[PDB]
Scaffold this motif. Structure first.
Motif, PDB file in Angstrom:
ATOM      1  N   UNK B  63      24.849  -4.061  29.695  1.00  0.00           N
ATOM      2  CA  UNK B  63      23.472  -4.119  29.186  1.00  0.00           C
ATOM      3  C   UNK B  63      23.393  -3.394  27.839  1.00  0.00           C
ATOM      4  N   UNK B  64      24.275  -2.455  27.572  1.00  0.00           N
ATOM      5  CA  UNK B  64      24.366  -1.695  26.289  1.00  0.00           C
ATOM      6  C   UNK B  64      24.700  -2.649  25.154  1.00  0.00           C
ATOM      7  N   UNK B  66      24.190  -5.934  24.981  1.00  0.00           N
ATOM      8  CA  UNK B  66      23.401  -7.141  24.912  1.00  0.00           C
ATOM      9  C   UNK B  66      22.479  -7.111  23.748  1.00  0.00           C
ATOM     10  N   UNK B  67      21.978  -5.933  23.326  1.00  0.00           N
ATOM     11  CA  UNK B  67      21.104  -5.740  22.153  1.00  0.00           C
ATOM     12  C   UNK B  67      21.768  -6.108  20.930  1.00  0.00           C
ATOM     13  N   UNK B  70      22.104  -9.862  20.393  1.00  0.00           N
ATOM     14  CA  UNK B  70      20.959 -10.484  19.786  1.00  0.00           C
ATOM     15  C   UNK B  70      20.853 -10.346  18.276  1.00  0.00           C
ATOM     16  N   UNK B  71      21.087  -9.161  17.685  1.00  0.00           N
ATOM     17  CA  UNK B  71      21.092  -8.892  16.288  1.00  0.00           C
ATOM     18  C   UNK B  71      22.239  -9.623  15.580  1.00  0.00           C
ATOM     19  N   UNK B  74      20.805 -13.184  14.938  1.00  0.00           N
ATOM     20  CA  UNK B  74      19.891 -13.286  13.887  1.00  0.00           C
ATOM     21  C   UNK B  74      20.641 -13.435  12.576  1.00  0.00           C
ATOM     22  N   UNK B 492      19.395  -4.954  10.531  1.00  0.00           N
ATOM     23  CA  UNK B 492      19.524  -5.345  11.929  1.00  0.00           C
ATOM     24  C   UNK B 492      20.626  -4.535  12.645  1.00  0.00           C
ATOM     25  N   UNK B 495      19.098  -1.302  13.554  1.00  0.00           N
ATOM     26  CA  UNK B 495      18.147  -1.701  14.618  1.00  0.00           C
ATOM     27  C   UNK B 495      18.840  -1.642  16.027  1.00  0.00           C
ATOM     28  N   UNK B 499      18.883   1.985  19.173  1.00  0.00           N
ATOM     29  CA  UNK B 499      18.237   1.525  20.404  1.00  0.00           C
ATOM     30  C   UNK B 499      19.046   1.435  21.621  1.00  0.00           C
TER      31      UNK B 499
ATOM     32  N   UNK C  36      16.391   2.475  29.736  1.00  0.00           N
ATOM     33  CA  UNK C  36      16.765   1.127  29.939  1.00  0.00           C
ATOM     34  C   UNK C  36      16.451   0.916  31.405  1.00  0.00           C
ATOM     35  N   UNK C 370      14.207 -10.806  18.731  1.00  0.00           N
ATOM     36  CA  UNK C 370      14.953 -10.306  19.829  1.00  0.00           C
ATOM     37  C   UNK C 370      14.092  -9.926  21.031  1.00  0.00           C
ATOM     38  N   UNK C 372      14.933  -7.571  23.113  1.00  0.00           N
ATOM     39  CA  UNK C 372      14.878  -6.123  23.171  1.00  0.00           C
ATOM     40  C   UNK C 372      13.786  -5.481  22.341  1.00  0.00           C
TER      41      UNK C 372
END
Lengths: 513, 509, 513
Positions: B63-64, B66-67, B70-71, B74, B492, B495, B499, C36, C370, C372
Motif C-alpha cells: 500500500x506504501x 501504490x501512491x 499513481x504519480x 500522471x 508530483x 507529492x 505522503x 493509512x 490521484x 490518494x
C-alpha cells in the motif's frame, strides 16, 4: 442421559453459579451503581444495571442460573420492581449458609433455619413500617420520587408522579371493594409517537387508540354506549366455499368479493340502528371502518373481551346487544371527561374514568419518539408504589437501612433463644448483612467500620427510621432524608429468595435427561 | 489488508517499496535503456524499459508503493521521461529520510524542509534554461529533443527510431499550439527489421483487408462488431445450418442476403465496411463481385481506434447507419505498409489525432521495446509544442540543483536544516543511478561533476568512457530535455514521497 | 461462560482503551500525520480524521465500540473534534489507574469526575469572549479548525474557500450544513485544489452549436424522466432480446419523442417571447439526438445528467418546484436563476447557476487526478464546512490550541475539596487529562512533551494571557494574539462526551463472555 453426583459436591456447583451473578448486581442496587458489560458472541456492547438481561442474551447454566431467570420474571408481572433485588438475596444466602453448616453436617436443619428467619423478618420489618395517608398527596409524593431516582432519573421524575398517583387509586378489581393491589393488565401504559410535556394529560382512566382514528368518527359524548355484536352487527366474517373449482374463471372473482360483501352486511346493521360506539373483538379493518364513518359512528377494533367489559364499567354504560335493548343499568355513570388529541392522522381517544376496574392505560409523552420508551419504564416503577400504598398505608422508611435492620435483628434473637437452631440462624443473619456493606464500598473507606456504627445504632436509637443510606455510606435519619423503600417490593423479594435458595439445598442430583 | 502495530508502516513498509522500485529505472534511465523481463497472466515474454508500464503490469501488494504508482501514471501522460524520475527521486528521499528519523527528527518537521526546498528547486530551474530551440516544422530540431527520451526506453537503434517518431509528430500538425496524447497510435505488424519500420498518417487496420477497391477519395465508413454470418436485425437474426436440407438452400441464399447487407450500409453512406464480425465463405464472394471494401476480422482494439477519431459508433445489430454511426476520413487507399498489404486511411486535416507508426519486427518481442520509445515520445512532443525552454541532457541538470540546495541548508537553519541537505543528496540519486548502471564507484561520478564545476553541462552518461572514467557535454550532443518535464516530475514526485512518509499502522481487529 | 470480577476485570477494559488512544496519538494538529487505513475492501484511504478511522475499521475490543459511539455523537452535533476527544479520555484513565492500583475504589474516582467536570463547563462561560461573524475573523477560526483535522498544506488551500461557503447563508445559523454540501470530484491537472463555485452546480451538461452558451434570464423548469418515453416519472421497459425486438424499440421512440418536444416549445413562447429570454430544461437521463436538435435551435438550453441530489438543491436555489415529466408548467412556479453558464474543464462539463434567489447551496469542486489525493482533500471539506458553521452560529468562541486547558487545570487547585476526598481523586485526575492537548503537540514537535508544558504553566501564571502550545511550531505563545481560536461548540461538547465515556469504563467491573 443419567449423570450421578451426590451430596455436598452438587451443592458447591450451586454456589459457584449463583454468586457470580449476584456480585455486580449487589453493587448495581442502591443509589450508587455499576455496569455489567456483556461481550457478545456477535460482538458489540450491551451493558445494563440488570443481571437477568445479560444472562438471557447468553449464558444459561443448569442450577442457579435458570432459577434466577424464572423467579425474577414472576417478580416483574407482580409489583414491577425488585427484579434486581431477588437475585442478590438468593445467591448471598446460599453462599454464606451452606459451607459451614455442611462441614458440621446438617443440611435439613438449615432448611428449617430459613423458615425461622422468614418468621422473624415479617414481624420486625412491619413494626418499623410507618403509616402515611393516601388522601394526602404530599406524603405520597416523597415515597414515589425515590423509586424513580433508584434508576437515577430526576428529569422525568416529576412527570411520572402526577400521572401515576391519582390513576392507580381509581383502578378497582371486579370484586369492586378493592383497590389494594392493582396488578398489571388492570393497570398499563401505552405510548403515542413524539409529543412533549405540554402535550401530556393526566389520565386516570383508559385510552383506546383504535377508537376515533378519523374526523368523521365520534367527537365528544361524555358517556358512550358500546354495542356488542349480536343484533346490530354479526358474528360472521369469512368466505364461503360451498362449491369451488380452479378450472372456473368466475370462481376467482366470486371468492374475493365474498369477503368484502360480508363486511358490508355487518356495517350496514350499525347504520340502520344508530349506535354511537360499536365494539368488535374479531378486529375490523380500515376499509370496513369506512362505512361506519358516514353514519358518524366510532369503531373500536382489535380488542379483547376482558378489556371491553371493564371498559364498559369505566365508560358509563353496560353491555347491550343493540341500541333498542335498554334494561336496568349496571353502571349509569362512570366517565367524567371525553377528550381527543391528534398526532398525525390518527386520533387518540382519552376518556377519564373514576373508580371502575378498567385497564387504566395512561398517556405519556417523551421529548422524542425514543424518549417515550424511557418515560414508560419510569411509570412502571411509579404505578408500583401506588399499588403498595393503596394495599398497605404502612411502609418502611428504608434505604438499605432495611436489609441491615433485619440482619441485626436476627443476631440478637439467636443469642437469646439458644437451642440447636442458633448456629444455622446466626449463619443467615450475616448473609443479609453482606448486601448493605457493598453500598458503603462505592462511598469509600473501611466498609466494616462504618457498618459497626449501624450495629450500635440499631439497639440504641432506631432500626431503620434512623438508618444508613448507600450514597453517604454513613448514618442519616432516613425519614428526614425522604428515602423510603416500598414495603411491597421488600416483602415479596425476601419470600421468593428463601425458597429458591431452599430449592437448591434440597437438590443433590443433576441428570441431563 | 492485515493488522499492524508499533507504527511499522512508516519504518518498515516505506523501505520495502523503495527497493521494489529500485533497479527497474536505476539502469533503464538515461542514455542507454535496459531490458527487464515481465511475464503476464497470458504468459509471454515482455520487455519493458519504461517506468509506467512495468507498474501497470505488476500487482502492487504494498500500500506504501501504490501512491507512487499513481504519480508515475500522471507523468506518463504528461512527459514520458518524468515518469522514470518519480520512482528514483522518491525512493532515494525515503532511504535518507529514514536516517534522520533515528536521530530524533519528527516526521513532519522534515516534511516542512522538503517543501521549502521544492519551491526553491523550481527557482533554480530557470538557471537551467540553457539555450532555446523549437521548430515544429522541422523534423531536424524535434528528433534531437526526443532523443534522450527514446534512449532511456530502448537499447536498439536510437538514431533511426528518432527520425520515425519526429516524422509522425511534426508532420501531422506543424501549426498546432497543443498536441494530443493519442495523437499517435501504434500499429504493430509482424515481419522485417526494426529499422524497416516506417511512418504513415491516419488509421491503419492491421488485421486482414479484403473486398475490392471502388474508391480512393470517398472513405465513408460504418463500424460493426455484428457478423454477416446470417445476423441481420431488420429481419430475423436466425440461421438455418442445423438441418442438412435447409443448410444447402441457406448457402445459396447467403449470397443474396449479403447483397442486401452491403447495399443497406452503402446507400446511406459507406465504401469501406469496417467489420469486427465475421465474413463467411459466401459472404466473401458477394462483396468481391459488388466491389465494396471489407476490413475483416477486426478485434475490439481495431474498432475502438477507428471510432474515437471519426465518431462512427458500433452496435452488434445491422440496420442502415444513422449519421452518428457514419464517419469519414480524408482518403483511403490500398498499399502495403512495411511490405504487408493493409488498408490505410488518411487523417491530417479531417480532425488529425491519429497518425500511425508501423512497428516491425519478425517477432513480437522486438516490437514491445520500440512501443515504449514511441508511446512515451508522443507525450515528449507535447511538452516541446507548449514551450521552447531547453534544459540540458540527463543527469547534467541534476548537479546544479544539488549545489544551490546545500547553500539552502546553510542560509536557512532550523530543524529543517537537516531535511534540506537530504533533499540535495536526493537529486544526486539520479546520476548515482547512472553510476550504478555503469558499475563504477558512485562517489567518483559525483566527484567529477563537482570538480569541473559545470552545472548544466557535465555528466557521466552511459558509454565505454563511463567504464574508465570521463565526463562529457550533454548540453551539446543531441541529448536535450525540456523545462516542464522536470517541473512536473519533481512536483508530483514530492507529492508522492511526503505522503507515504506520513503513514502509520493500519488499524483492524 | 468465563467472568472476570473486581479490579482485575476493570483492568481489561482500561488497558484496551488506553491502547487505542495511543495509536491515534500520532494525529492532532498539522504537526501530526496521516494514517493509512485499508479496510477489507481495498483502496487507500489516507485520513488523519478520527471519525473516519473509527468507523471504517479499528481494533476489536469492547472499548472500540465506545470510542466510536462518542465519536458518532460529537461528529453529528458539532462535526469537529473527534481526534481531540480520544486523547483526553485516555489520560483520564491513566491517572484513575494509579489510585485504584494503590487500593482504592473505581467508583470514588468516577464521582469526583462529575464534580470536576461541572466546574469546567462553568469555566468555559467566563473564558469565552464574543468575536466577530465578519469574514476575516472567521478565516482565523477556519484556519485552526482545518488544522486539527488534516495536514498544514491541505488546511491552507481550504481556508478562504470554506469561509465563503458558510457566509453565504441568509442569516440562518445552525451548527451544521445540510444543503451546502455538494461534492463534485474531478481527475484533473491540478494534483490538489478546491475551487469556489457559488450556487448549485450540475453534474454534466449537453451543448450544441446553436445552444445559448451565456443565458442572462433563465427560467428553469426542472424535469426528470424523459424524452425517450412519454408519460413517465420512472423508466419504461426495453425490447432488444431478439433481433426483431430491436427494431421495434427504436421505431416507437419516434412517437414518444414527438409527443414530448411540443410541450416545451409552447411553454417557451409564453415565458420568454420568441427567443428574447432564455429557457433551461433539466434532463436527469438520456437526451435523444432528435430532441437535442430541436430544443437547441429553438433557444432552449438542454442539460444532460443531473442527479436526484441536484434536484433537491435546485428547487431551493431557483424558487421553482420539481416536475418529473416534460410538460407544460405555469410561469409562476418556474424558478429564476439570473445567470447560467457552462465551463467545460477536463472531460466534464460544469454548468453553474448563479444569482441564487435563496443561497443555502454552494459547491466546492474537488480536483485530484490521484485516488490518494482525492480522499485527503474531499474529506477535509466536510468536517471543515461544519466546523466554521459552528463558529458563525456561536456568538462567543473560546481561545484555542490548549489555551483554556491549562487555565482550567490550575484554577481547579488541589486541596480545594475536603468532603471525604472522594471528590479529591477526580478533580486531581481531570487536571492531568486536560493537559494531554499541550503534550501531544509537544510530542509532534521538537523538545520533550513535559518540557514545553511547564513553560505553559509558568506563562499561565502571568494573567492577561492564555497560553498554549502552537500548532505550527510547538512552542509557547499567547494564542489570542496569533489568532488561533477554536469555536465554542467543540470545547462544550468535548466535556460532556469525554466524562460520560470514561465514567462508564470504571463502572464496568463485570465483563461476561
Amino acid at each position: 442421559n443419567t449423570k450421578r453426583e451426590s451430596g455436598r459436591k452438587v451443592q458447591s456447583g450451586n454456589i459457584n453459579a449463583a454468586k457470580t451473578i449476584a456480585d455486580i448486581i449487589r453493587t448495581c442496587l442502591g443509589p450508587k451503581s455499576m455496569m455489567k458489560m456483556l461481550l457478545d458472541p456477535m460482538g458489540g456492547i450491551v451493558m445494563t444495571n440488570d443481571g437477568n438481561a445479560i444472562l438471557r442474551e447468553i449464558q444459561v447454566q443448569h442450577p442457579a442460573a435458570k432459577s434466577m431467570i424464572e423467579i425474577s420474571r414472576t417478580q416483574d408481572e407482580e409489583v414491577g420492581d425488585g427484579t434486581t433485588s431477588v437475585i442478590i438475596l438468593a445467591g448471598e444466602m446460599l453462599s454464606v449458609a451452606e459451607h459451614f453448616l455442611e462441614q458440621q453436617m446438617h443440611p435439613t436443619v438449615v432448611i428449617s433455619a430459613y423458615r425461622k428467619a422468614l418468621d422473624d423478618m415479617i414481624s420486625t420489618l412491619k413494626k418499623i413500617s410507618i403509616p402515611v395517608d393516601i388522601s394526602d398527596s404530599d406524603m405520597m409524593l416523597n415515597i414515589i420520587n425515590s423509586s424513580i431516582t433508584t434508576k437515577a432519573i430526576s428529569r422525568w421524575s416529576s412527570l411520572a408522579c402526577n400521572i401515576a398517583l391519582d390513576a392507580v387509586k381509581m383502578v378497582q378489581f371486579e370484586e369492586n371493594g378493592r383497590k389494594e393491589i392493582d396488578i398489571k393488565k388492570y393497570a398499563r401504559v401505552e405510548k403515542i409517537p413524539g409529543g412533549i410535556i405540554e402535550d401530556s394529560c393526566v389520565l386516570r382512566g383508559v385510552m383506546i387508540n383504535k377508537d376515533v382514528t378519523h374526523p368523521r368518527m365520534r367527537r365528544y359524548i361524555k358517556n358512550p354506549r358500546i354495542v356488542l355484536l349480536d343484533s346490530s352487527l354479526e358474528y360472521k366474517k369469512g368466505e364461503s366455499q360451498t362449491d369451488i373449482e380452479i378450472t372456473r374463471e368466475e370462481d376467482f372473482t366470486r371468492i374475493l368479493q365474498m369477503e368484502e360483501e360480508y363486511i358490508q352486511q355487518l356495517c350496514e346493521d350499525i347504520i340502520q340502528l344508530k349506535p354511537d360506539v360499536v365494539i368488535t373483538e374479531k378486529g375490523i379493518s380500515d376499509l370496513a371502518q369506512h362505512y361506519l364513518m358516514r353514519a358518524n359512528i366510532t369503531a373500536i377494533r382489535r380488542v379483547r373481551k376482558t378489556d371491553n367489559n371493564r371498559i364498559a364499567r369505566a365508560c358509563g354504560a353496560r353491555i347491550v346487544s343493540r341500541p333498542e335493548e335498554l334494561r336496568e343499568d349496571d353502571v349509569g355513570t362512570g366517565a367524567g371527561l371525553l377528550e381527543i388529541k391528534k398526532i398525525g392522522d390518527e386520533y387518540f381517544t382519552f376518556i377519564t374514568d373514576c373508580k371502575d376496574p378498567k385497564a387504566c392505560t395512561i398517556l405519556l409523552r417523551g421529548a422524542s419518539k425514543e424518549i417515550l420508551s424511557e418515560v414508560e419504564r419510569n411509570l412502571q416503577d411509579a404505578m408500583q408504589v401506588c399499588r403498595n400504598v393503596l394495599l398497605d398505608p404502612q411502609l418502611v422508611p428504608g434505604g438499605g437501612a432495611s436489609e441491615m435492620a433485619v440482619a441485626h435483628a436476627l443476631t440478637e434473637k439467636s443469642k437469646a433463644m439458644t437451642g440447636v437452631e442458633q448456629w444455622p440462624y446466626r449463619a443467615v443473619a450475616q448473609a443479609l448483612e453482606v448486601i448493605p456493606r457493598t453500598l458503603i464500598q462505592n462511598c469509600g473507606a473501611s466498609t466494616i467500620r462504618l457498618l459497626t456504627s449501624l450495629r450500635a445504632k440499631h439497639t440504641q436509637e432506631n432500626c431503620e427510621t434512623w438508618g444508613v443510606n448507600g450514597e453517604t455510606g454513613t448514618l442519616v435519619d432516613m425519614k428526614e432524608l425522604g428515602i423510603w423503600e416500598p414495603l411491597a417490593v421488600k416483602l415479596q423479594t425476601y419470600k421468593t429468595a428463601v425458597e429458591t435458595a431452599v430449592l437448591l439445598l434440597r437438590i443433590d442430583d443433576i441428570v441431563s435427561g | 489488508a492485515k493488522h499492524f502495530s508499533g507504527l511499522e508502516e512508516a519504518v518498515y513498509r516505506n523501505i520495502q517499496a523503495c527497493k521494489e522500485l529500485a533497479q527497474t529505472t536505476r539502469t533503464a534511465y538515461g542514455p542507454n535503456g535496459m531490458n527487464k523481463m515481465v511475464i503476464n497472466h497470458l504468459e509471454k515474454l515482455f520487455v519493458t524499459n519504461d517506468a509506467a508500464t512495468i507498474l501497470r503490469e505488476l500487482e502492487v501488494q504494498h500500500p506504501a508503493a501504490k501512491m507512487i504508482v499513481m504519480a508515475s501514471h500522471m507523468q506518463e501522460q504528461e512527459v514520458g521521461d518524468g515518469t522514470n524520475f518519480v520512482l528514483v527521486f522518491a525512493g532515494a528521499l525515503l532511504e535518507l529520510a529514514e536516517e534522520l528519523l533515528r536521530i530524533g527528527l519528527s516526521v513532519s518537521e522534515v516534511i516542512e524542509g522538503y517543501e521549502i526546498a521544492c519551491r526553491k528547486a523550481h527557482e533554480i530551474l530557470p538557471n537551467l534554461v540553457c539555450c532555446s530551440a523549437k521548430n515544429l516544422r522541422d523534423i531536424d530540431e524535434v528528433s534531437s529533443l526526443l532523443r534522450t527520451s527514446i534512449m532511456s526506453k530502448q537499447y536498439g537503434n536510437e538514431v533511426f527510431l528518432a527520425k520515425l517518431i519526429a516524422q509522425a509528430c511534426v508532420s501531422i500538425f506543424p501549426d498546432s499550439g497543443h498536441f494530443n496524447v493519442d495523437n499517435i497510435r501504434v500499429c504493430k505488424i509482424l515481419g522485417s527489421g526494426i529499422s524497416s519500420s516506417s511512418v504513415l498518417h491516419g488509421m491503419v487496420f492491421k488485421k486482414e483487408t479484403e473486398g475490392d477497391v471502388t474508391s480512393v477519395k470517398d472513405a465513408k465508413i460504418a463500424v460493426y462488431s455484428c457478423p454477416f454470418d446470417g445476423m441481420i436485425t431488420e429481419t430475423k437474426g436466425t440461421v438455418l445450418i442445423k438441418t442438412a436440407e435447409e443448410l444447402m438452400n441457406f448457402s445459396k441464399g447467403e449470397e443474396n442476403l449479403m447483397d442486401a447487407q452491403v447495399k443497406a450500409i452503402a446507400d446511406t453512406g459507406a465504401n469501406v465496411v469496417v467489420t469486427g464480425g465475421k465474413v463467411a465463405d459466401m459472404a466473401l464472394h458477394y462483396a468481391n463481385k459488388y466491389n465494396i471494401m471489407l476490413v475483416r476480422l477486426n478485434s475490439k482494439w481495431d474498432l475502438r481506434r477507428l471510432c474515437k477519431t471519426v465518431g462512427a459508433t458500433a452496435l452488434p445489430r445491422l440496420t442502415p447507419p444513422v449519421l452518428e454511426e457514419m464517419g469519414h476520413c480524408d482518403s483511403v487507399y490500398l498499399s502495403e505498409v512495411g511490405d504487408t498489404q493493409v488498408v490505410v486511411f488518411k487523417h491530417e486535416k479531417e480532425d488529425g489525432a491519429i497518425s500511425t507508426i508501423v512497428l516491425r519486427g519478425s517477432t513480437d518481442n522486438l516490437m514491445d521495446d520500440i512501443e515504449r520509445a514511441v508511446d512515451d515520445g508522443v507525450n515528449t512532443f507535447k511538452v516541446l509544442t507548449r514551450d521552447k525552454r531547453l534544459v540540458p541532457g540527463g543527469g547534467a541538470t541534476e548537479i546544479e540543483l544539488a549545489k544551490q540546495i546545500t547553500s539552502y541548508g546553510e542560509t536557512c537553519p532550523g530543524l529543517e536544516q537537516y531535511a534540506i541537505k537530504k533533499f540535495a543528496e536526493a537529486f544526486e540519486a539520479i546520476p548515482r543511478a547512472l553510476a550504478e548502471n555503469s558499475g563504477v564507484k558512485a562517489n567518483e561520478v559525483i566527484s567529477k561533476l563537482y570538480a569541473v564545476h559545470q552545472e548544466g553541462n557535465k555528466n557521466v552518461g552511459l558509454d565505454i568512457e563511463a567504464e574508465v572514467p570521463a565526463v562529457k557535454d550533454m548540453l551539446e550532443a543531441g541529448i536535450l530535455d525540456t523545462y516542464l518535464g522536470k517541473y512536473w516530475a519533481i512536483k508530483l514526485a514530492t507529492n508522492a514521497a511526503v505522503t507515504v512518509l506520513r503513514v502509520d499502522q493500519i488499524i483492524m481487529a | 461462560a468465563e467472568v472476570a470480577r473486581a479490579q482485575a476485570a476493570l483492568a481489561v477494559n482500561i488497558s484496551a482503551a488506553r491502547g487505542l488512544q495511543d495509536v491515534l496519538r500520532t494525529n492532532l494538529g498539522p504537526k501530526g500525520t496521516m494514517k493509512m487505513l485499508v479496510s477489507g475492501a481495498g483502496d487507500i484511504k489516507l485520513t488523519k480524521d478520527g471519525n473516519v478511522l473509527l468507523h471504517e475499521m479499528q481494533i476489536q475490543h469492547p472499548t472500540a465500540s465506545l470510542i466510536a459511539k462518542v465519536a458518532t455523537a460529537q461528529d453529528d452535533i458539532t462535526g469537529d473534534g473527534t481526534t481531540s476527544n480520544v486523547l483526553i479520555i485516555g489520560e483520564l484513565l491513566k491517572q484513575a489507574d494509579l489510585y485504584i492500583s494503590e487500593g482504592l475504589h473505581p467508583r470514588i474516582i468516577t464521582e469526583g469526575f462529575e464534580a470536576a467536570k461541572e466546574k469546567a463547563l462553568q469555566f468555559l462561560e467566563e473564558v469565552k469572549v464574543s468575536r466577530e461573524m465578519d469574514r476575516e475573523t472567521l478565516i482565523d477560526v477556519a484556519r485552526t479548525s482545518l488544522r486539527t483535522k488534516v495536514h498544514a498544506e491541505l488546511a491552507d488551500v481550504l481556508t478562504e474557500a470554506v469561509v465563503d461557503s458558510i457566509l453565504a447563508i441568509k442569516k440562518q445559523d445552525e451548527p451544521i450544513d445540510l444543503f451546502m454540501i455538494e461534492i463534485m470530484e474531478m481527475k484533473h491537472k491540478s494534483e490538489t485544489d478546491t475551487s469556489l463555485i457559488r450556487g448549485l452546480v450540475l453534474d454534466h451538461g449537453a451543448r450544441h452549436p446553436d445552444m445559448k452558451k451565456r443565458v442572462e434570464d433563465a427560467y428553469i423548469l426542472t424535469c426528470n424522466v424523459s424524452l425517450e418515453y412519454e408519460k413517465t416519472e420512472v423508466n419504461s421497459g426495453f425490447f432488444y432480446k431478439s433481433a426483431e425486438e430491436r427494431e421495434k424499440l427504436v421505431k416507437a421512440e419516434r412517437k414518444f419523442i414527438e409527443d414530448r418536444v411540443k410541450k416545451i416549445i409552447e411553454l417557451k413562447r409564453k415565458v420568454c417571447g420568441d427567443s428574447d429570454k432564455g429557457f433551461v430544461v433539466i434532463n436527469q437521463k438520456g437526451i435523444d439526438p432528435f430532441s437535442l436538435d430541436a430544443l437547441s435551435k429553438e433557444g432552449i438550453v438542454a442539460l444532460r445528467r443531473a442527479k436526484r441530489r441536484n434536484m433537491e438543491r435546485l428547487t431551493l436555489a431557483c424558487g421553482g418546484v420539481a416536475l418529473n415529466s416534460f410538460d407544460d408548467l405555469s410561469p409562476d412556479c418556474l424558478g429564476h436563476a439570473g445567470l447560467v453558464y457552462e465551463y467545460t474543464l477536463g472531460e466534464e462539463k460544469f454548468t453553474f447557476i448563479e444569482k441564487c434567489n435563496n443561497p443555502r447551496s454552494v459547491t466546492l469542486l474537488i480536483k485530484g487526478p490521484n485516488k490518494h489525493t482525492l480522499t485527503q482533500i474531499k474529506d477535509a471539506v466536510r468536517d471543515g464546512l461544519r466546523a466554521v458553521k459552528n463558529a458563525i452560529d456561536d456568538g462567543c468562541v473560546v481561545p484555542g490550541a490548549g489555551a483554556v486547558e491549562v487555565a482550567m487545570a490550575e484554577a481547579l487547585i488541589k486541596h480545594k475539596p475536603s468532603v471525604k476526598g472522594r471528590a479529591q481523586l477526580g478533580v486531581q485526575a481531570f487536571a492531568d487529562a486536560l493537559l494531554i492537548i499541550p503534550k501531544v503537540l509537544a510530542q509532534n514537535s521538537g523538545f520533550d512533551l513535559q518540557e514545553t508544558l511547564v513553560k505553559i504553566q509558568a506563562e499561565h501564571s502571568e494573567s492577561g494571557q492564555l497560553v498554549g502550545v502552537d500548532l505550527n511550531t510547538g512552542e509557547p505563545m499567547v494564542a489570542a494574539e496569533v489568532g488561533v481560536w477554536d469555536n465554542y461548540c467543540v470545547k462544550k461538547q468535548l466535556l460532556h462526551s469525554c466524562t460520560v465515556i470514561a465514567t462508564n469504563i470504571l463502572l464496568v467491573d463485570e465483563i461476561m463472555r
